[PDB]
């Protein structure tokens, strides 16, 4: 055949790729699809959320396109019958995969930009014009055509420029154009130095006299001229993508190839022996690889100019800030003023000898060069204040000597703060900005591949996904870090935004790395081979990502002291200020909820986050009982994010409901929670300051009981539950009257109470039986059966206590009462299981949790009936058995949860 079967499969790969190119432009015309946000400040914040989040989503996926373009040019750089055409089809799929999410991504942006300025239409036409450049690039990918390579090179160069023009349309062109156009100053210089050496390789061709050797020089030179023109075409693609490391390997890939082209050409230059042009050819080839080296020296510094490492030890800066107030406090004495300048000259210079030691143990030298810059500000400010304090001490009445002392004090204290904070936060710019952004594109490329993997079979019914079952999990965890990226850029000084980025990183590492092992497991599952190559590639990119996360995680955890106790109180201050605005917003009565919020879902999310924050509350009490623990600020940070998730969940269901009475209820219950939570952190600071004090241990324990009482106010404020707390109150308060000072007024006869108790117990278990029968139904049907079972229990409670006085001995009666106490407490835990069963009916373990609690009350009543009723008719033995038959009957109805933990063979015996 003219082309191999891999190229025949590449033809179907091209026809599948180019079909989705024009279809993405046709689907672009349905732009807005916009739900209304309204006047809600949380919706305006959600408008501010989706602005910064979706801006990085387009910015992430364009880098893999620019990496995917030149990789085709690197693969096609060889001769025919020497090119892995299967790897070529891998790079064109991920370009089209990002092209699909680019259309849907800017579709939300077209509705976004229409609200603010309405000037998004040049972004739409530049994106469709960018996709048309890939279509002609896909036409150049056909190997059967006789088109030259430079036709493919110049067609691909317009794709990389217009992508940066689309990045210029976005506004996230973070790389400075003085560095981007300097690459054009280098790449055009390389091809000029190549073509000059090609002419030197063409000059020695006439000097050769042997056949085959003259053709050997020109074929290496024309390939060198092709590879250096490929470098010009590659640099036009990666000119705004110099920060993206996923394409930087492709630079030195062809950089190795032009080194191979130099070594192929410089091997033929030595064949021209005893030549005057032999001497100039080696020096030209030495300067040819120098320009690739001098580009690569700037290429490392292209990444290094954003990533600057430095260590903020600050073992000497704390001695600087303490002695600065001694000058203004001792103003007026000549003896005490001149002695404090010698101590400040030693406290400042104690960091100078340690700043240079930090740069020696460091890898990159951007902030370390700024450490040389910041220490010179610390050295120059201490050099001019010694002469200023000398004139101010000897001449105290001089106004010019005192004015120079005031301006020199601020030029050292804030400069040391400029020396400290820039040492630690540009390290986080190296850490955290490179953490999430490289993890962002590598995450969704797996999502684009797995969706391409799920669409590869004809039927997607039951693909058994290890990725897509966790892709939906991690995609909610993606923009939590990205929201804190620009917030760290907007707020560099306060570390609490940066401390949340540390917590967002470790919370992303647990579901992240689990997917990467599942990604490598899903590699040979796909029948298509080219899709698995990017699946192998992105897993290496995720493997490259997760290694840098843990370096950012443990080092930034040790970057500052454990003072998160005071910052955790300021987190809930932002919540209560917005909730008071929500209190004004719920007073207005026109609130639009978020489209992701659902009333059946968020109430389950409220109760799950309710038990989550109280779990760390009990964790807080153990650290308080220890005292002076660094994990106390950790757990106080944990309960801040739990209440923050509880705040948006409470504000989610507030705009979902329409009853204005319960809107004030869900506000006042939530406001009383943070009011009690404000008392938690205020006393936990007193608990951390005072170790071993048992008085503060019982104080917050009583508050945490009232917190769980206030958490139960958030349970009782739900309109979905109907009188189940009243069913708890009807069961609970009638039994506490039965425990303390309860005597039946009329005992009657023993036969009239025995026949009454058996029939009253028959419908009692049947009302308990329909609890698991209504487990398949609506949760409001569980609230219906809670009232009938709670009323019939109190009807059975009066009938049970009536025959308590029929026993002659009260110790036999108190045994019956204590057994009746065991029935009442088992029904209470059955009711305590019912408050979560109606809350979370979807949980299968919570079904059997109530069902085992349902079996507990039915077994506790059959034993007391055997104690009280007469066994001489013998019909009560059938009566106790018939109740237990119906309880296990409906337990067989829903086989979703196992009863015990024994295995299959343990069940057979």
């Amino acid at each position: 055949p003219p082309l191999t079967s891999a190229q025949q499969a590449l033809t179907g790969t091209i026809n599948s790729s180019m079909q989705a190119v024009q279809a993405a432009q046709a689907t672009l015309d349905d732009f807005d699809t916009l739900p209304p946000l309204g006047q809600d400040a949380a919706s305006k914040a959600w408008r501010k959320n989706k602005m910064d989040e979706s801006k990085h989503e387009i910015h992430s996926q364009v880098d893999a396109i620019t990496a995917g373009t030149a990789s085709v040019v690197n693969l096609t750089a060889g001769d025919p019958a020497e090119t892995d055409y299967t790897a070529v089809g891998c790079a064109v799929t991920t370009i089209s995969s990002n092209l699909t999410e680019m259309s849907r991504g800017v579709k939300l942006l077209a509705a976004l930009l229409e609200d603010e300025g309405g000037s998004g239409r040049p972004l739409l036409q530049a994106a469709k014009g960018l996709a048309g450049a890939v279509s002609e690039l896909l036409r150049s990918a056909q190997p059967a055509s006789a088109e030259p390579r430079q036709n493919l090179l110049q067609a691909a160069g317009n794709v990389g420029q217009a992508s940066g023009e689309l990045l210029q349309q976005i506004g996230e062109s973070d790389t400075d154009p003085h560095f981007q156009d300097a690459l054009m100053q280098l790449a055009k210089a390389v091809a000029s130095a190549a073509a000059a050496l090609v002419l030197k390789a063409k000059s020695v061709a006439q000097r050769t006299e042997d056949s085959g050797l003259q053709t050997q020089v020109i074929a290496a030179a024309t390939q060198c001229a092709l590879s250096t023109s490929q470098l010009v075409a590659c640099t036009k693609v990666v000119a705004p993508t110099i920060s993206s490391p996923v394409c930087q390997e492709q630079l030195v890939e062809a950089g190795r190839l032009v080194a191979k082209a130099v070594e192929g050409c410089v091997s033929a230059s030595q064949a021209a022996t005893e030549d005057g042009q032999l001497l100039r050819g080696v020096g030209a080839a030495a300067t040819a690889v120098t320009q690739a080296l001098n580009e690569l020296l700037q290429h490392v510094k292209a990444h290094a100019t954003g990533a600057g490492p430095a260590g903020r030890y600050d073992q000497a800066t704390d001695t600087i800030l303490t002695v600065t107030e001694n000058i203004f406090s001792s103003m007026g004495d000549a003896g005490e003023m001149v002695r404090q300048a010698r101590i400040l000259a030693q406290a400042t210079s104690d960091l100078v000898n340690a700043i240079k030691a930090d740069a020696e143990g460091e890898s990159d030298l951007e902030n370390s060069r700024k450490l040389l810059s910041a220490a010179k500000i610390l050295a120059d400010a201490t050099a001019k204040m010694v002469e200023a304090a000398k004139g101010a001490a000897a001449h105290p009445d001089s106004e010019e000597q005192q004015q120079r002392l005031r301006e020199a004090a601020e030029g050292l204290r804030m400069a040391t703060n400029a020396a400290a904070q820039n040492a630690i936060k540009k390290k986080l710019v190296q850490r955290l900005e490179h953490a999430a952004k490289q993890a962002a594109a590598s995450a969704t490329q797996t999502i684009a591949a797995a969706q391409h993997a799920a669409s590869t079979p004809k039927a997607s019914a039951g693909p058994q996904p290890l990725l897509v079952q966790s892709c939906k999990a991690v995609a909610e965890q993606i923009p939590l870090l990205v929201q804190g990226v620009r917030g760290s850029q907007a707020q560099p000084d306060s570390p609490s935004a940066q401390l949340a980025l540390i917590a967002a990183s470790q919370s992303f590492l647990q579901p992240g790395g689990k997917m990467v092992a599942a990604a490598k497991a899903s590699v040979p599952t796909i029948q298509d081979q080219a899709s698995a190559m990017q699946l192998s590639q992105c897993a290496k990119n995720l493997g490259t990502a997760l290694a840098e996360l843990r370096t950012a995680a443990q080092k930034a955890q040790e970057a500052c002291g454990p003072l998160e106790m005071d910052s955790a109180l300021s987190v809930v201050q932002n919540l209560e200020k917005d909730l008071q605005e929500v209190k004004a917003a719920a007073r207005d009565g026109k609130l639009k909820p978020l489209p992701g919020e659902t009333m059946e879902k968020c109430t389950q999310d409220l109760g799950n986050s309710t038990k989550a924050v109280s779990s760390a509350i009990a964790q807080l009490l153990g650290e308080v009982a220890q005292g002076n623990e660094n994990y106390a600020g950790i757990a106080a940070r944990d309960v801040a994010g739990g209440l923050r998730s509880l705040a948006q969940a409470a504000r989610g269901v507030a705009a979902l409901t329409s009853d204005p009475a319960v809107q004030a209820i869900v506000l006042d219950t939530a406001s009383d929670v943070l009011d009690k939570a404000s008392s938690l952190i205020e006393e936990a600071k007193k608990a951390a300051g005072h170790p071993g004090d048992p008085e503060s241990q019982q104080r917050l324990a009583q508050v945490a009981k009232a917190v769980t009482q206030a958490l139960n106010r958030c349970v009782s404020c739900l309109p979905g539950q109907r009188d189940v707390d009243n069913a708890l109150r009807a069961v609970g308060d009638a039994s506490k009257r039965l425990l303390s000072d309860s005597l039946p007024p009329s005992t009657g006869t023993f036969q009239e109470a025995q026949s009454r108790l058996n029939e009253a117990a028959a419908g009692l278990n049947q009302a308990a039986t329909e609890l698991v029968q209504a487990s398949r139904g609506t949760p409001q049907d569980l609230a219906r059966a809670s009232g009938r079972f709670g009323q019939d229990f109190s009807t059975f409670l009066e009938a049970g206590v009536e025959m308590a006085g029929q026993a002659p001995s009260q110790e036999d009666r108190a045994q019956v009462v204590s057994n009746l106490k065991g029935i009442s407490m088992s029904s209470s835990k059955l009711l305590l299981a019912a408050k979560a069963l109606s809350t979370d009916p979807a949980a299968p373990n919570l079904k059997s949790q109530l069902a085992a609690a349902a079996r507990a009350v039915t077994d506790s009543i059959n034993q007391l009936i055997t104690m009280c009723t007469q066994q001489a008719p013998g019909q009560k033995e059938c009566d106790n058995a018939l109740r237990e038959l119906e309880t296990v009957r409906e337990l067989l109805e829903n086989p979703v949860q196992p009863i015990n933990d024994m295995s299959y063979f343990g069940c057979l015996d």
Binding site: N608, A612, S615, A618, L621, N845
Partner: protein, 48 residues
């Protein structure tokens, strides 16, 4: 509690009975503390 259990085993004293009854309140707290930690649903159950 065992130090008060062995003290009450055979004591039958009303004022000495409340010594173990008052010491159970830190016991019932820490028992309900870990069950509150067990109420965390990501630690409690994973659906199938």
């Amino acid at each position: 509690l065992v130090k008060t259990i062995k003290a009450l085993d055979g004591a039958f004293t009303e004022e000495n009975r409340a010594q173990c009854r008052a010491a159970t309140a830190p016991l019932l707290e820490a028992v309900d503390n870990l069950s509150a930690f067990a109420s965390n649903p990501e630690f409690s159950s994973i659906p199938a």
